[PDB]
Specification:
The structure is a monomer. With about 325 residues, this protein is mainly beta. The protein folds into two domains: about 170 residues, Cathepsin D, subunit A, domain 1; about 160 residues, Cathepsin D, subunit A, domain 1, CATH 2.40.70. About 5% of the residues lie in helices and about 45% in strands. It contains four helices and 24 strands. A seven-stranded mixed beta sheet has the order 18-17-12-13-22-14-21. Strands 2-3-8-4-7-6 form a six-stranded mixed β-barrel. The chain has a four-stranded antiparallel beta sheet with strand order 15-16-20-19, with no helix packed on it. It starts with a strand and ends with a strand. Keywords: Aspartyl protease, Disulfide bond, Hydrolase, Protease, Signal, Zymogen. It catalyses: Hydrolysis of proteins with specificity similar to that of pepsin A, prefers hydrophobic residues at P1 and P1', but does not cleave 14-Ala-|-Leu-15 in the B chain of insulin or Z-Glu-Tyr. Clots milk. Belongs to the peptidase A1 family. One of its GO terms (molecular function) is aspartic-type endopeptidase activity.
Length: about 325
Protein backbone atom coordinates (compact mmCIF):
# COMPACT_ATOMS: atom_id res chain seq x y z
CA UNK A 1 0.00 0.00 0.00
CA UNK A 2 0.82 3.68 -0.28
CA UNK A 3 -0.62 7.02 0.77
CA UNK A 4 -0.16 10.59 -0.45
CA UNK A 5 -1.46 13.74 1.22
CA UNK A 6 -1.00 17.44 0.62
CA UNK A 7 0.41 19.49 3.48
CA UNK A 8 -0.44 23.21 3.66
CA UNK A 9 1.17 26.10 5.55
CA UNK A 10 -1.09 27.43 8.30
CA UNK A 11 -0.18 31.04 7.56
CA UNK A 12 1.82 33.28 5.23
CA UNK A 13 5.09 32.63 7.10
CA UNK A 14 5.02 28.80 7.02
CA UNK A 15 4.87 28.79 10.84
CA UNK A 16 3.61 25.19 10.63
CA UNK A 17 1.98 22.80 8.15
CA UNK A 18 -1.34 20.97 8.38
CA UNK A 19 -2.34 17.75 6.67
CA UNK A 20 -5.90 16.39 6.54
CA UNK A 21 -6.41 13.08 8.35
CA UNK A 22 -9.53 10.89 8.37
CA UNK A 23 -10.41 9.43 11.78
CA UNK A 24 -13.22 7.04 12.58
CA UNK A 25 -16.33 5.72 10.84
CA UNK A 26 -17.89 7.70 9.20
CA UNK A 27 -14.72 9.67 8.64
CA UNK A 28 -14.07 12.75 10.73
CA UNK A 29 -11.46 14.89 8.97
CA UNK A 30 -9.05 16.82 11.18
CA UNK A 31 -6.10 18.93 10.11
CA UNK A 32 -3.03 17.64 11.92
CA UNK A 33 0.53 18.86 12.29
CA UNK A 34 2.77 16.01 11.11
CA UNK A 35 5.69 16.02 13.52
CA UNK A 36 8.81 13.92 12.95
CA UNK A 37 10.05 15.18 16.34
CA UNK A 38 7.36 13.46 18.44
CA UNK A 39 5.45 10.20 18.53
CA UNK A 40 1.91 10.86 19.73
CA UNK A 41 -1.16 11.18 17.53
CA UNK A 42 -3.42 13.44 19.57
CA UNK A 43 -6.50 15.47 18.73
CA UNK A 44 -8.85 18.13 19.97
CA UNK A 45 -11.99 16.21 20.92
CA UNK A 46 -15.45 16.20 22.43
CA UNK A 47 -13.59 15.55 25.72
CA UNK A 48 -11.42 18.68 25.56
CA UNK A 49 -12.25 21.25 28.26
CA UNK A 50 -14.67 23.63 26.54
CA UNK A 51 -12.83 26.82 27.53
CA UNK A 52 -9.71 25.47 25.78
CA UNK A 53 -11.35 24.90 22.38
CA UNK A 54 -11.52 27.96 20.07
CA UNK A 55 -12.25 27.19 16.43
CA UNK A 56 -10.62 23.77 16.13
CA UNK A 57 -12.32 20.79 14.58
CA UNK A 58 -12.85 18.09 17.20
CA UNK A 59 -12.89 14.32 17.14
CA UNK A 60 -16.00 12.85 18.71
CA UNK A 61 -15.35 9.16 19.41
CA UNK A 62 -18.97 8.51 20.41
CA UNK A 63 -19.93 9.25 16.77
CA UNK A 64 -17.48 6.67 15.40
CA UNK A 65 -18.66 3.06 15.06
CA UNK A 66 -15.05 1.86 15.01
CA UNK A 67 -13.84 3.77 18.09
CA UNK A 68 -12.92 1.74 21.16
CA UNK A 69 -11.73 3.10 24.50
CA UNK A 70 -8.20 1.94 25.29
CA UNK A 71 -9.19 1.23 28.83
CA UNK A 72 -6.99 2.71 31.54
CA UNK A 73 -4.67 4.47 29.09
CA UNK A 74 -3.62 8.07 29.59
CA UNK A 75 -1.13 10.36 27.88
CA UNK A 76 0.65 13.59 28.67
CA UNK A 77 3.12 15.48 26.53
CA UNK A 78 5.10 18.70 26.57
CA UNK A 79 6.90 20.16 23.58
CA UNK A 80 10.10 22.20 23.30
CA UNK A 81 8.22 25.51 23.20
CA UNK A 82 6.62 24.83 26.58
CA UNK A 83 3.23 23.83 25.18
CA UNK A 84 1.45 20.73 26.44
CA UNK A 85 -1.61 18.50 26.28
CA UNK A 86 -2.97 15.41 27.99
CA UNK A 87 -5.96 13.07 28.05
CA UNK A 88 -7.15 9.53 27.44
CA UNK A 89 -6.98 7.17 24.47
CA UNK A 90 -9.17 5.49 21.88
CA UNK A 91 -8.25 3.14 19.08
CA UNK A 92 -9.83 3.86 15.73
CA UNK A 93 -9.39 3.76 12.00
CA UNK A 94 -7.06 6.45 10.70
CA UNK A 95 -6.43 7.23 7.04
CA UNK A 96 -3.86 9.55 5.48
CA UNK A 97 -4.02 10.21 1.78
CA UNK A 98 -5.63 6.86 0.98
CA UNK A 99 -3.51 4.81 3.40
CA UNK A 100 -5.56 3.22 6.19
CA UNK A 101 -4.48 1.93 9.61
CA UNK A 102 -7.01 0.09 11.76
CA UNK A 103 -6.57 0.09 15.54
CA UNK A 104 -4.49 3.25 15.60
CA UNK A 105 -4.12 4.89 19.01
CA UNK A 106 -5.91 8.23 18.85
CA UNK A 107 -5.10 10.25 21.93
CA UNK A 108 -8.05 12.41 22.93
CA UNK A 109 -7.15 15.69 24.62
CA UNK A 110 -8.86 16.52 27.89
CA UNK A 111 -6.50 19.48 28.40
CA UNK A 112 -4.41 21.62 26.04
CA UNK A 113 -2.15 24.57 26.85
CA UNK A 114 -3.00 28.09 25.70
CA UNK A 115 -0.82 28.09 22.61
CA UNK A 116 -2.87 25.19 21.22
CA UNK A 117 -6.17 26.88 22.05
CA UNK A 118 -4.98 30.09 20.43
CA UNK A 119 -4.16 28.36 17.15
CA UNK A 120 -7.45 27.60 15.45
CA UNK A 121 -5.79 25.99 12.41
CA UNK A 122 -4.22 22.96 14.13
CA UNK A 123 -6.61 20.23 15.28
CA UNK A 124 -3.89 18.01 16.73
CA UNK A 125 -0.51 16.42 16.05
CA UNK A 126 0.49 13.24 14.22
CA UNK A 127 3.83 12.05 15.51
CA UNK A 128 6.36 10.47 13.13
CA UNK A 129 9.44 10.04 15.35
CA UNK A 130 10.18 6.60 16.80
CA UNK A 131 7.50 4.92 18.91
CA UNK A 132 9.86 4.77 21.88
CA UNK A 133 8.92 8.42 22.54
CA UNK A 134 5.18 7.75 22.66
CA UNK A 135 3.76 8.97 26.00
CA UNK A 136 0.81 6.59 26.44
CA UNK A 137 0.77 4.83 29.80
CA UNK A 138 0.76 2.03 30.89
CA UNK A 139 1.10 0.56 27.40
CA UNK A 140 3.16 2.63 24.98
CA UNK A 141 1.52 2.94 21.55
CA UNK A 142 2.88 2.85 18.00
CA UNK A 143 2.93 5.76 15.57
CA UNK A 144 0.81 5.79 12.45
CA UNK A 145 3.95 5.03 10.40
CA UNK A 146 5.02 2.13 12.59
CA UNK A 147 1.55 0.62 12.34
CA UNK A 148 1.43 1.09 8.55
CA UNK A 149 5.01 0.02 7.85
CA UNK A 150 4.54 -3.69 7.20
CA UNK A 151 1.75 -2.96 4.73
CA UNK A 152 3.66 -0.33 2.79
CA UNK A 153 5.25 -1.11 -0.56
CA UNK A 154 8.47 0.23 0.96
CA UNK A 155 9.04 1.07 4.66
CA UNK A 156 9.47 4.82 4.11
CA UNK A 157 7.73 8.14 4.19
CA UNK A 158 8.84 11.37 2.53
CA UNK A 159 8.48 15.03 3.43
CA UNK A 160 8.32 17.56 0.62
CA UNK A 161 7.45 20.84 2.33
CA UNK A 162 6.69 23.93 0.30
CA UNK A 163 8.03 27.45 0.67
CA UNK A 164 4.97 29.66 1.03
CA UNK A 165 3.08 26.92 -0.79
CA UNK A 166 1.60 23.46 -0.29
CA UNK A 167 3.72 20.32 -0.32
CA UNK A 168 3.37 16.57 0.09
CA UNK A 169 3.75 13.74 2.59
CA UNK A 170 4.05 10.34 0.88
CA UNK A 171 3.96 6.95 2.58
CA UNK A 172 5.39 3.78 1.11
CA UNK A 173 7.07 5.09 -2.05
CA UNK A 174 9.61 7.61 -3.33
CA UNK A 175 8.26 9.96 -6.03
CA UNK A 176 11.22 10.22 -8.38
CA UNK A 177 9.59 13.21 -10.16
CA UNK A 178 9.63 15.25 -6.95
CA UNK A 179 13.36 16.03 -6.74
CA UNK A 180 16.42 16.88 -8.83
CA UNK A 181 19.69 14.98 -8.95
CA UNK A 182 20.13 12.06 -6.56
CA UNK A 183 19.10 11.32 -2.99
CA UNK A 184 21.99 11.22 -0.55
CA UNK A 185 21.44 8.92 2.38
CA UNK A 186 23.01 9.39 5.78
CA UNK A 187 23.11 7.42 9.04
CA UNK A 188 20.52 7.77 11.77
CA UNK A 189 20.81 7.22 15.51
CA UNK A 190 17.55 6.16 17.12
CA UNK A 191 18.99 6.20 20.67
CA UNK A 192 17.06 9.35 21.67
CA UNK A 193 13.96 8.35 19.66
CA UNK A 194 14.53 11.00 16.96
CA UNK A 195 15.55 11.02 13.32
CA UNK A 196 19.01 12.05 14.51
CA UNK A 197 21.82 12.45 12.00
CA UNK A 198 25.09 14.28 11.45
CA UNK A 199 25.47 17.06 8.91
CA UNK A 200 28.94 17.35 7.38
CA UNK A 201 29.13 21.14 7.52
CA UNK A 202 27.86 24.46 6.25
CA UNK A 203 28.41 27.52 4.14
CA UNK A 204 27.02 31.04 4.37
CA UNK A 205 26.01 32.57 1.04
CA UNK A 206 28.78 32.21 -1.53
CA UNK A 207 31.31 31.53 1.21
CA UNK A 208 33.57 28.52 1.43
CA UNK A 209 32.16 25.33 2.86
CA UNK A 210 33.25 24.59 6.42
CA UNK A 211 33.67 20.86 7.06
CA UNK A 212 32.44 20.18 10.58
CA UNK A 213 30.16 17.58 12.13
CA UNK A 214 26.79 18.89 13.29
CA UNK A 215 24.57 16.40 15.07
CA UNK A 216 20.88 17.23 14.91
CA UNK A 217 17.37 16.00 14.29
CA UNK A 218 15.14 16.19 11.27
CA UNK A 219 12.00 17.70 12.79
CA UNK A 220 9.01 18.71 10.67
CA UNK A 221 7.27 19.93 13.85
CA UNK A 222 9.85 22.65 14.52
CA UNK A 223 9.52 25.76 12.38
CA UNK A 224 13.06 27.14 12.38
CA UNK A 225 16.64 25.96 11.97
CA UNK A 226 18.45 25.71 15.33
CA UNK A 227 22.22 25.32 15.15
CA UNK A 228 25.27 25.91 17.35
CA UNK A 229 25.93 29.51 18.35
CA UNK A 230 29.19 29.58 16.41
CA UNK A 231 27.42 28.63 13.16
CA UNK A 232 24.52 31.01 13.72
CA UNK A 233 26.84 33.91 14.59
CA UNK A 234 28.76 33.32 11.34
CA UNK A 235 25.49 33.47 9.40
CA UNK A 236 24.08 36.68 10.90
CA UNK A 237 27.45 38.42 10.70
CA UNK A 238 26.82 38.51 6.94
CA UNK A 239 23.53 40.40 7.37
CA UNK A 240 23.77 44.15 7.68
CA UNK A 241 22.24 45.34 10.94
CA UNK A 242 21.42 41.89 12.35
CA UNK A 243 21.67 41.41 16.10
CA UNK A 244 20.77 38.91 18.78
CA UNK A 245 18.00 40.37 20.91
CA UNK A 246 17.41 38.96 24.39
CA UNK A 247 14.09 40.83 24.67
CA UNK A 248 12.79 39.35 21.41
CA UNK A 249 14.41 35.95 21.99
CA UNK A 250 16.73 35.53 19.05
CA UNK A 251 18.39 37.09 16.03
CA UNK A 252 16.50 39.87 14.30
CA UNK A 253 17.38 41.87 11.23
CA UNK A 254 16.04 44.80 9.22
CA UNK A 255 13.95 43.53 6.32
CA UNK A 256 15.63 46.11 4.13
CA UNK A 257 18.57 43.71 4.43
CA UNK A 258 19.24 40.96 1.92
CA UNK A 259 19.58 37.51 3.45
CA UNK A 260 22.33 35.20 2.20
CA UNK A 261 21.58 31.57 1.53
CA UNK A 262 22.65 28.87 3.99
CA UNK A 263 24.08 25.57 2.81
CA UNK A 264 24.24 22.42 4.93
CA UNK A 265 26.09 19.22 4.14
CA UNK A 266 24.63 15.76 3.73
CA UNK A 267 27.61 13.53 3.23
CA UNK A 268 29.41 14.93 0.21
CA UNK A 269 26.16 16.52 -1.02
CA UNK A 270 24.85 20.03 -0.32
CA UNK A 271 21.38 21.43 0.39
CA UNK A 272 20.98 25.16 -0.21
CA UNK A 273 18.43 27.11 1.81
CA UNK A 274 17.61 30.30 -0.14
CA UNK A 275 17.87 33.52 1.84
CA UNK A 276 14.14 34.21 1.49
CA UNK A 277 13.38 31.04 3.50
CA UNK A 278 15.12 32.57 6.52
CA UNK A 279 12.76 35.61 6.77
CA UNK A 280 9.97 35.19 9.35
CA UNK A 281 8.67 38.70 9.14
CA UNK A 282 8.12 41.56 11.55
CA UNK A 283 8.60 40.79 15.22
CA UNK A 284 5.33 42.64 15.84
CA UNK A 285 2.83 44.11 13.40
CA UNK A 286 4.28 47.17 11.68
CA UNK A 287 7.81 46.70 12.97
CA UNK A 288 10.81 47.14 10.70
CA UNK A 289 12.63 44.45 12.72
CA UNK A 290 12.27 40.95 11.27
CA UNK A 291 12.72 37.61 13.02
CA UNK A 292 15.41 35.29 11.70
CA UNK A 293 14.79 31.73 10.60
CA UNK A 294 18.18 30.50 11.78
CA UNK A 295 18.61 30.64 15.53
CA UNK A 296 20.93 29.30 18.19
CA UNK A 297 20.30 25.88 19.71
CA UNK A 298 22.25 26.79 22.84
CA UNK A 299 20.02 25.94 25.78
CA UNK A 300 17.88 23.47 23.79
CA UNK A 301 20.41 20.68 24.18
CA UNK A 302 20.11 19.52 20.59
CA UNK A 303 20.40 20.99 17.10
CA UNK A 304 17.17 20.97 15.11
CA UNK A 305 16.81 20.83 11.35
CA UNK A 306 13.29 22.21 11.34
CA UNK A 307 11.06 23.30 8.46
CA UNK A 308 13.41 26.10 7.33
CA UNK A 309 15.98 23.44 6.45
CA UNK A 310 13.69 20.60 5.46
CA UNK A 311 11.56 22.65 3.04
CA UNK A 312 14.69 23.23 0.94
CA UNK A 313 14.87 19.48 0.31
CA UNK A 314 13.06 16.32 -0.60
CA UNK A 315 13.49 14.26 2.54
CA UNK A 316 13.26 10.49 2.88
CA UNK A 317 12.56 9.02 6.30
CA UNK A 318 13.66 5.43 5.74
CA UNK A 319 12.21 3.12 8.37
CA UNK A 320 14.00 -0.01 7.25
CA UNK A 321 15.49 -2.28 9.94
CA UNK A 322 18.40 0.14 10.08
CA UNK A 323 16.80 3.53 9.60
CA UNK A 324 18.46 6.21 7.50
CA UNK A 325 17.63 9.71 6.18
CA UNK A 326 17.84 10.80 2.56
CA UNK A 327 18.10 14.33 1.22
CA UNK A 328 17.74 15.59 -2.37
CA UNK A 329 17.61 19.06 -3.86
CA UNK A 330 14.37 19.96 -5.60
Amino acid sequence: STGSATTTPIDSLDDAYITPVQIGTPAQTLNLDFDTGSSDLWVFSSETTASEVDGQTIYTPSKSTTAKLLSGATWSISYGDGSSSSGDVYTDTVSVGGLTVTGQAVESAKKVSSSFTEDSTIDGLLGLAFSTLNTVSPTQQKTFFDNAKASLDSPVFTADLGYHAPGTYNFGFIDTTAYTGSITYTAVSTKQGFWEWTSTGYAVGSGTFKSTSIDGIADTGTTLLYLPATVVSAYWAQVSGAKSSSSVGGYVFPCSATLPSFTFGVGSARIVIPGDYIDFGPISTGSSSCFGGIQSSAGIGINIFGDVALKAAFVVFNGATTPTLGFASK
